[PDB]
Amino acid sequence: TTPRFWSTPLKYCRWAARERPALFFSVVIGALGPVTLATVPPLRRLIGDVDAAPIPLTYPIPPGPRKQLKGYDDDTED
Amino acid sequence: PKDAVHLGLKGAAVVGGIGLLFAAVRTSLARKNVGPWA
Amino acid sequence: MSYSQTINSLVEVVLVLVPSLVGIAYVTVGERKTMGSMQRRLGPNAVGIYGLLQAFADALKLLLKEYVGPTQANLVLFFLGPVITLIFSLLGYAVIPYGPGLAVNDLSTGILYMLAVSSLATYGILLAGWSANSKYAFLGSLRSTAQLISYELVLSSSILLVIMLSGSLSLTVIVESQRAIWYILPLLPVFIIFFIGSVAETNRAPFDLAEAESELVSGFMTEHAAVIFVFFFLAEYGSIVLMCILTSILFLGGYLLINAPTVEGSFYGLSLGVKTSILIFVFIWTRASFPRIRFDQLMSFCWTVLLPILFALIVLVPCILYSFNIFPVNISLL
Amino acid sequence: NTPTQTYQFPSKTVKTDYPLIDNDPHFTRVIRYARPSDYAHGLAAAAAGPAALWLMERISPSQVGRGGFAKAMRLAGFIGLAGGFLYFYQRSILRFYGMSENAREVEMDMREMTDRVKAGLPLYGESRLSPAMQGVAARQSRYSALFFGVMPWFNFVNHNQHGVDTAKYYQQAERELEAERLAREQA
Amino acid sequence: MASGYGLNGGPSRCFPFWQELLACYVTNSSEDNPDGKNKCIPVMEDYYECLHHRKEAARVRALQAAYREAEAKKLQENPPTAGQIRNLGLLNKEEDTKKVHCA
Amino acid sequence: MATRKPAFNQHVLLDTTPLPDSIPKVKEIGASSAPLLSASFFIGARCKDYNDDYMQCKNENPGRGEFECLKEGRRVTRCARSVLKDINTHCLEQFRAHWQCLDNNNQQLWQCRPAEWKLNKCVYENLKLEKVIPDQPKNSTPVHLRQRQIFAHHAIPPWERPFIPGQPE
Amino acid sequence: NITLILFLIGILGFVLNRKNIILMLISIEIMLLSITFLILLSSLNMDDIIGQTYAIYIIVVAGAESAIGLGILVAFYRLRGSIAIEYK
Amino acid sequence: MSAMSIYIIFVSIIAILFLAIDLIFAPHNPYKEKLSAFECGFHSFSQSRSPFNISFFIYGLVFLLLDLEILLLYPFAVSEYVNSAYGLAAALIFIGIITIGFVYELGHDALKVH
Amino acid sequence: SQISLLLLKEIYTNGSTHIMLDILSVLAVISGICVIISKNPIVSVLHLIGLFAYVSFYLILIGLNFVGLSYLIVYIGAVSILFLFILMLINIRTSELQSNTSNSIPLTILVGIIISSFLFKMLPYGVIISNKNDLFFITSKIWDGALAENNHISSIGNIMYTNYNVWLILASFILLLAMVGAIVITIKPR
């Protein structure tokens, strides 16, 4: 009565949807994530959606040598 | 020149201390209750 | 600060506990009056005007009613279980935000805190039922254990999907996050599943198996009487209200709106209470609409229908979040 | 221009018989630098599994019911295919590691990179990941094909931590740019 | 300690002490000179000191008993009240701040 | 003392010993948390080089930069007292309105944007100091220059405009 | 100090147990509690998030061990009919 | 004193105040048949302290492991901004291995009491 | 003259009292003993959940809120199931009748002293602290390390799925073997 998946994969998918919906649609929902992961980011960049830059979670220490500043020295107090 | 008598007690205490351990273990494996002071 | 710290915490606890205990009294009255209206009845309308003193006639009657200590019962456990259930059911109201940070404890791990106090209160039901040494109390206590195996993963897995959007575990931050949108819109299946699991969490119909009266006589609380019985009802209805507050916190924007601070605080409290009262209605509506499920049928439903769907969402939801660059910052902000 | 520094991270030196190209080569490079023997050996290795289970069936029948052998071939087919690809991947990456003869890979690497350096493109690409997450990824996958039999792992991050000094690439590109300018003068 | 990942999402307190010890070992020890790793003895003691605080607890202990016995012997004239310590550094409590400093 | 957050603290220890005459003296910053957050973008608009120089000094003396960068620290304090005085000689009503608003709003910038816009314009026309946040997305309008705040408990009046320097009203 | 006291309770509750095999599986739980609790207090004193991670992985294997133990007890009880350790 | 500690104090004293009132102001007349076990009117064999068959013990064994698994996902939900793609992948591998064990529970019909 | 070192009481923002840790310590030890000496198996599993509770409250009070709440969450369900198995595999009435001899006391004293004395120096100064001039821990504040303080659960999440992902894969395979094995040995035949 129940279809065999390898005998006929398209028939099995119809039976699983109708007769075992909670289990069948769990696999569809769970599989939709990897499909989202593989397809949305390319389309997002195609349409110009740009992933934002990370927010700083540590003081951003600049690179290169120090800038040899002259200002706000001790003699400027008073 | 070593104190044989002073050493002898230490050797008895160490080896005999192990004896209390196997004595206490043999006491705990006794099927009939006989009391802690056995 | 301005005045004493102990006096502040004293008044802050009273402003939560006492009004919540008044609320527990009237959810019982409202249930009886609302089930009656759907049954073409009235409900309590004689003990007090419109029956507004009926919860206190019930409460005062039992604290003046004789208690029985069964001879076959484990007496110290017969009293300890209801006390555990009552104390830990009431402990959940200490993290409820009635406004941004307006809680007795604005904990950063408030959601996990609630999962820990709800699980303890369930263990009191198990202990009290087994301690009677009566057979219906014994059969009911086993049902409570089966029910927790059924609904604890359901709730915790459902909650984890809310945390994947809020990024906090703090109850105030999850409400603050819903200023964007209420979580019942993007998480519509999770709201249904969480609500279903909350009815099962509460031992409420159609999942009233531990205390079923058509199958058991009173289930776990059959041998229990007087104030020990008062504890199990206070635990049940405070647990109902608390689960309706939490469902409103997690999916309905909590306190968000649909002398100067008092107007703002009142409106926050009204908004949360209005949304909580709607969900309290849906509990009573669900009790008057459905039959009881079998306990094996509930275990099968939670384990082969609800849990497979939830784990699929646990995979799916962060995959959508990363795809759209929508992972929430996990720093303190809102 | 010259990055003024070509070894920025501390790497592990392994005693091997051939030049090290990349201690963590990207997935695409392993497939692109694969020799056609690697597809011959990995296809033979994938076929070995189900063919072993077929031969065991012919000489010593399992006496299984009507649909069992077909089920078992589907598992033997996948496991062979899974181990065949892991074998195909290991053959190409050992050459990147200097643990197999790599003259051809050494010369295509020294051209592809000096092509990226004369073009100003980053040697190993741009990551969407943070520079610390790039490091955790380099640390997780470097020399990870040597554990393929137990736990597998592939590099899918465009990090810049590959265990080699990048000075050779910049040296060749500038000399190639030096030769290009002189040739362009006679025009 | 030695991991580099502390309780607040920042790095561990004894991570600089550990990175210095490993740096010392790799930059001094070798098979040619086995005894180059004796340079690491003070560096390895600092890492344990950062971790368990036995040497600093011994220093404060000796200093605290020495300090207290001098306080009892010291001449006492007037002790500042708790409220006076609270007043130090405030907007309009110049009198109390001066009393705290014996000035 | 340790950077660990205390769990059983019941006492505070104070030292009345002053820093020795050798180390030059810097008068400390007197602003509170609300005024300092309201003027933080102005700090960095003027004091960035010194703020960045003191941090690169400490990174150049690992484990010892507390003692060995005392002059760079004295310089950052002076740079920061300069903007505070400047924000006080001018734009003092606007400055007060902003940080007094911030204290009643959990110190959340998005909850006081109209007072920020008014102050930012007054700081710009008397100090040439602009609020700049690095790496904000170019696809969308900067969040601090947005008319509608989604997390603001009170909606921003339609008649309150964000301050963008240069373009007139 | 409490970590040592708890470890000794679990070690004797496992060795000097004359009640049932479920209590022996509880004593293993107590020992893992004490070992985990020592790692947690040390982590706090050394500012190490790894020892909290280590403690978390002890909890997950501690529950996995208690599932295999309870599963093996059910197998044993099904045939023996008593899980009571017995001394003549 | 903190509100949390005071809250625990009150809920305990409410549990005492109700309990004390009943223990003082209610009648107490315990006698033989009042103190007996309910069994709907007829005394029966006392069997509640003898080994009883739980037909859903395989569900308790699985609940313990899955409780451990969803606990190992809560750190991820509060650390997504830092974890990003690289951390999401490992969290997906972790969920994927756990789901296969659940598929074993469903296929073998362990959770299907009859 | 000049004191210069001033002790003061913290009016607000002060922490808990460390008296409460010694209370939880005795109760945890008290409840730990009652788990093994109790005649009734249910009474000893109740002392077991209590024992996990004082340890969790000990962890919460020293700022280990996640692992403290997570310990409690995991074990309340674990003790409930362990309760569930005592009612299926143990005759409660015959176990209460079952007793215990006093012949184990000599071994208890010997084993207790030897292990505890030997296992004491195996523990570091940080733990043996607070075992008439005592020491006081001093803490101050930092601004660079406080820019975006994470909660402990977030700090573990920062590394649990990247830096230490191998521990997660191995842990997930212990759980898988437990899920498959516990069912295989107890499943009803079909």
Give the closest residue to D129 by CA, choosing from A51, C64, G80: A51
Partners of F8 on chain I (C-beta within 8 Å) are 15-18
What's the token pair of residue C33? 């009056």
Kindly list the distances between the CA atom of residue G70 and the CA atoms of G24, G31, H53, in Å, as whole numbers in the listed order: 11, 17, 15
Kindly list the distances between the CA atom of residue F11 and the CA atoms of E62, I6, I13, I132, I139, in Å, as whole numbers in the listed order: 21, 10, 10, 18, 11
Concatenated DSSP letters of chain F: -B-SPPSS--EEEEE-PPPPTTSPP-PPP---HHHHHHTHHHHHHHHHHHHHHHHHHHHHSTTTHHHHTHHHHHHHHHHHHHHHHHHHHSSHHHHHHHHHHHHTTTT-GGGSHHHHHHHHHHHHHHH------TT--SSS--GGG-S--SS-SS---TT-----SSS--
I143 close contact with C: CB closer than 8 A: no
The angle formed by the CA atoms of residues F16, F22 and F24, to the nearest 5 degrees, is 85
Q: Is G47's CB within 8 Å of E51's CB?
A: no
Q: Which of D136, D139, D150, D156 best probes binding to I when mutated, by most I CB atoms within 10 angstroms?
A: D136
Give the closest residue to I81 by CA, choosing from H65, C306, C159, C235: H65
- Distance from C-alpha of D161 to C-alpha of D180, rounded to nearest angstrom: 30
Partners of F16 on chain I (C-beta within 8 Å) are 2-4, 6
What's the token pair of residue G12? 């004797």
The angle formed by the CA atoms of residues I58, I62 and I63, to the nearest 5 degrees, is 120
Kindly list the distances between the CA atom of residue F57 and the CA atoms of D27, F63, I25, in Å, as whole numbers in the listed order: 41, 11, 47
Calculate the CA dihedral of residues I110, I111, I115, I117 and round it to 10 degrees: -20
Residue F70: CB atoms within 10 A of its CB come to 16
I142 close contact with A: CB closer than 8 A: no
C115: Cα within 13 Å, side-chain hemisphere: 31
Is there a contact between C117 and I57 (Cβ–Cβ < 8 Å)?
no
- Distance from C-alpha of D12 to C-alpha of D24, rounded to nearest angstrom: 12
Is there a contact between A23 and A16 (Cβ–Cβ < 8 Å)?
yes
- Distance from C-alpha of H8 to C-alpha of C164, rounded to nearest angstrom: 31
- Distance from C-alpha of I17 to C-alpha of H92, rounded to nearest angstrom: 43
Partners of C100 on chain F (C-beta within 8 Å) are 106
Q: Which residues of C249-324 form beta strands (DSSP E)?
A: none
- Distance from C-alpha of I78 to C-alpha of C109, rounded to nearest angstrom: 21
- Distance from C-alpha of D75 to C-alpha of G77, rounded to nearest angstrom: 37
Q: Which residues pair with C82 in a beta bridge?
A: none
Residue G13 lies in a domain: yes
Is residue C46 classed exposed, middle or buried when 0-12, 13-18 and 19+ CB atoms within 10 A define those classes?
exposed
Residue G34 is part of which domain span? 1-80
Residues 6+ apart with CB under 8 A from I17: F8, F10
How would you classify residue G81: left for phi > 0, otherwise alpha for psi between -120 and 50, otherwise beta? Answer: left
Residue G86 lies in a domain: no
Taking the CA of residue H2 and the nearest CA in chain G, the distance in Å comes to 24
Q: How far apart are the first and last CA of chain H?
A: 55
Is there a contact between A2 and A15 (Cβ–Cβ < 8 Å)?
yes
Number of structural domains (chain G) is: 1
Cα dihedral sign for A14, A20, A25, A31? negative
Neighbours of chain G (3+ CB pairs under 8 A): B, E, H, I
**Nominal resolution in Å?**
2.8
Residue I3 lies in a domain: no
- Distance from C-alpha of F8 to C-alpha of I138, rounded to nearest angstrom: 11
Helix axes H3-25, C5-38, angle to 10 degrees: 60
- Distance from C-alpha of C279 to C-alpha of C281, rounded to nearest angstrom: 5
Looking at chain G, the residues that come just before a C–N gap of over 2.5 A are none
Neighbours of chain C (3+ CB pairs under 8 A): A, F, H, I
| Experiment used for this model | cryo-EM
Residue I154 lies in a domain: yes
Q: How far apart are the first and last CA of chain F?
A: 53
Taking the CA of residue F11 and the nearest CA in chain E, the distance in Å comes to 12
Cα dihedral sign for I159, I164, I166, I167? negative
Cα dihedral sign for G40, G46, G48, G54? negative
What single-letter DSSP state applies at residue A51?
P
- Distance from C-alpha of E7 to C-alpha of F94, rounded to nearest angstrom: 40
Kindly list the distances between the CA atom of residue C10 and the CA atoms of C21, C291, H2, H5, in Å, as whole numbers in the listed order: 16, 45, 9, 10
Give the closest residue to F87 by CA, choosing from F141, F117, F123: F123
Q: Is E85's CB within 8 Å of F14's CB?
A: yes
Q: Is D128's CB within 8 Å of A54's CB?
A: no
N residues, chain G: 88
What single-letter DSSP state applies at residue C303?
I
Neighbours of chain E (3+ CB pairs under 8 A): F, G, I
Give the closest residue to E11 by CA, choosing from A58, F57, C168, D133: A58
Helices (H), chain A: 9-19, 21-46
What single-letter DSSP state applies at residue C245?
H
I147 close contact with A: CB closer than 8 A: yes
Residue I92 is part of which domain span? 18-185
- Distance from C-alpha of C188 to C-alpha of C190, rounded to nearest angstrom: 5
What's the token pair of residue D66? 């009507």
Concatenated DSSP letters of chain I: ----EEEEE--SS----THHHHHHHHHHHHHHHHHHH-SSHHHHHHHHHHHHHHHHHHHHHTT-HHHHHHHHHHHHHHHHHHHHHHHHH--HHHHHH----STTHHHHHHHHHHHHHHTTTTS-HHHHTT--------B---SSTTTTPPPHHHHHHHHHTTTTHHHHHHHHHHHHHHHHHHHHHHPPP-
Residue I7 lies in a domain: no
Single-letter amino acid code for the residue at I106: P
Residue G21: CB atoms within 10 A of its CB come to 19
Residue D126's φ and ψ, nearest 5 degrees, are -110, 130
- Distance from C-alpha of A21 to C-alpha of E22, rounded to nearest angstrom: 58
Cis peptide before C206 (omega within 30 of 0): yes
- Distance from C-alpha of I80 to C-alpha of C144, rounded to nearest angstrom: 10
What's the token pair of residue H30? 């315990």
E1 close contact with G: CB closer than 8 A: yes
Q: Where are the domains of chain F?
A: 1-169
Concatenated DSSP letters of F23-72: SPP-PPP---HHHHHHTHHHHHHHHHHHHHHHHHHHHHSTTTHHHHTHHH
The radius of gyration computed from the CA coordinates of chain E, to the nearest angstrom, equals 23
Is there a contact between D136 and H83 (Cβ–Cβ < 8 Å)?
no
Q: Is B20's CB within 8 Å of I110's CB?
A: yes
What's the token pair of residue C31? 């249930």
Residue I190 lies in a domain: no
Helix axes G50-80, I65-89, angle to 10 degrees: 0
N residues, chain H: 114
Is there a contact between C12 and H5 (Cβ–Cβ < 8 Å)?
no
Residue I173 lies in a domain: yes
* CB burial readout E57-95, b (16+ within 10 A) else e: eeeeeeeeeeeeeeeeeeeeeeebeeebbebbeeeeeee
Helix axes H57-71, G50-80, angle to 10 degrees: 170
- Partner residue facing I150 (CB), from E9, E51, E82: E9
Give the closest residue to H59 by CA, choosing from F7, C295, F119, G39: C295
Single-letter amino acid code for the residue at G21: I
Q: Is C67's CB within 8 Å of H28's CB?
A: yes
What's the token pair of residue C14? 């009273």
Report the CATH number at residue G75: 1.10.287.3510
Helices (H), G47-85: 50-80
Give the closest residue to G20 by CA, choosing from H58, I181, H48, I38: I38
In a 3-state reduction of DSSP, which class is residue G44? Answer: helix
Is there a contact between G6 and G40 (Cβ–Cβ < 8 Å)?
no
Is there a contact between H111 and H58 (Cβ–Cβ < 8 Å)?
yes
Helix axes C226-251, C188-202, angle to 10 degrees: 170
Kindly list the distances between the CA atom of residue C100 and the CA atoms of C161, C202, C213, D99, in Å, as whole numbers in the listed order: 22, 27, 42, 62
- Distance from C-alpha of I107 to C-alpha of B28, rounded to nearest angstrom: 7
Q: Is F11's CB within 8 Å of I136's CB?
A: yes
Q: Is H64's CB within 8 Å of G60's CB?
A: no
Q: Which of G40, G46, G50 best probes binding to E when mutated, by most E CB atoms within 10 angstroms?
A: G46
Kindly list the distances between the CA atom of residue A23 and the CA atoms of A16, A26, A28, A32, in Å, as whole numbers in the listed order: 8, 5, 9, 14
What domains lie within chain H, and their CATH numbers? 3-108 (1.20.58.1610)
Only one residue has tokens 């005459």, namely F21
What single-letter DSSP state applies at residue C183?
T
Partners of A4 on chain D (C-beta within 8 Å) are 67
H88 close contact with G: CB closer than 8 A: no
Residue G70 lies in a domain: yes
Residues 6+ apart with CB under 8 A from E53: I125, I126
Q: Is F56's CB within 8 Å of A53's CB?
A: no
Single-letter amino acid code for the residue at I187: I
